[PDB]
Amino acid sequence: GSIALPAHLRLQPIYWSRDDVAQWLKWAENEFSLRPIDSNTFEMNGKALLLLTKEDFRYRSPHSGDELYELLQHILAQARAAFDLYFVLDKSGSVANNWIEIYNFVQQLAERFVSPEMRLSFIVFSSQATIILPLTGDRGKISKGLEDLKRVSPVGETYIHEGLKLANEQIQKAGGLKTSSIIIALTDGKLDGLVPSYAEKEAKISRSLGASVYAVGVLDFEQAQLERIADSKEQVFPGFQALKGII
Ligand SMILES: [Mg+2]
């Protein structure tokens, strides 16, 4: 249901290392007030920990083990529902008064993904890219980020490449194992200069990092432009909140 899985362990246990298994034993010892667990109990990586039976956890950890085994089974279920969302919001002068629709789309979509493993990140761009909310799962920090999204004044030009770059850097910091990273862009496709060339180039970098690029058209949007940023035409939509919740 709800596991207080910290950083460096948010990834799937199959992608863990030997130091991550030790960090998992140190976290579980204080989270569940377990007996002093020796660090040399599970001298193996994450892939080898998934092959052991529950009787092996009892042998290596007589006091716990059964708790460490069942906790690993719940963490595997948390990783299946784990997902990283990135909201790329266009705060340029092109959206103007339509920024209320961008805020309502993010607010209504944030009220649905209430899972503890669901982490959100707010990145607005408009002649400058600034990550308002870093990637976190704390609902209090997300509610703080939502209020700051309303504090945004639509001023600047459209430069999606700089906004998608900050999203890919967070995906790069999470790594390719965080394939559940999803980028949700809320723009109007009103690009100028070589930005159409850099927006499609930066989008391919997101695809190389194992991320899905979803585009949300606001007011008027060049469909041919957003289909090149997104993976396909199906991932482009102006209902739409349910479509984002389904995929
Ligand atoms: Mg603009």
Residue numbers in the entry: 1 to 238, 242 to 250
Give sentences from the paper.
The ‘TELSAM’ variant of the human translocation ETS leukaemia (TEL) protein sterile alpha motif (SAM) domain is a 75-amino-acid (9 kDa) polymer-forming crystallization chaperone that is soluble at pH > 8. However, when the pH decreases below 7, TELSAM forms a six-subunit-per-turn helical polymer that can enable fused target proteins to co-crystallize. TELSAM reduces the entropic cost of crystal nucleation and growth by pre-freezing some degrees of freedom in the crystal lattice. Additionally, pre-ordering many thousands of copies of the target protein along the polymer results in substantial avidity to strengthen the subsequent target protein–target protein interactions that are formed when adjacent TELSAM polymers associate.
The batch 2 crystals that diffracted X-rays were obtained in 100 mM sodium acetate pH 4.6, 2.0 M sodium formate. One of these crystals diffracted to 3.3 Å resolution. Taken together, these data suggest that the vWa domains in this crystal may adopt at least six different orientations (one in chain A, at least two in chain B and at least three in chain C). An alternative possibility is that interaction with the PGM drug molecule may have partially misfolded the chain B and C vWa domains or disordered their positions in the crystal. In this scenario, the chain B vWa domain may still be partially resolved because it interacts with two copies of chain A vWa domains from two distinct 32-axis polymers. However, no clear sign of PGM was detected in the electron density. We were able to refine this model to only relatively poor R work and R free values of 0.28 and 0.31, respectively, which diminishes confidence in the space-group assignment and molecular-replacement solution. The interface of the chain A vWa domain with the chain B vWa domain buries 99 Å2 of solvent-accessible surface area and is more polar. Specifically, the side and main chains of Leu219 and Asp220 of the chain A vWa domain make hydrophobic and van der Waals interactions with Arg139, Gly140 and Ser143 of the chain B vWa domain. Nevertheless, the multiple observed binding modes in this crystal establish that the vWa domain can stably adopt multiple binding modes and that doing so does not abolish useful X-ray diffraction.
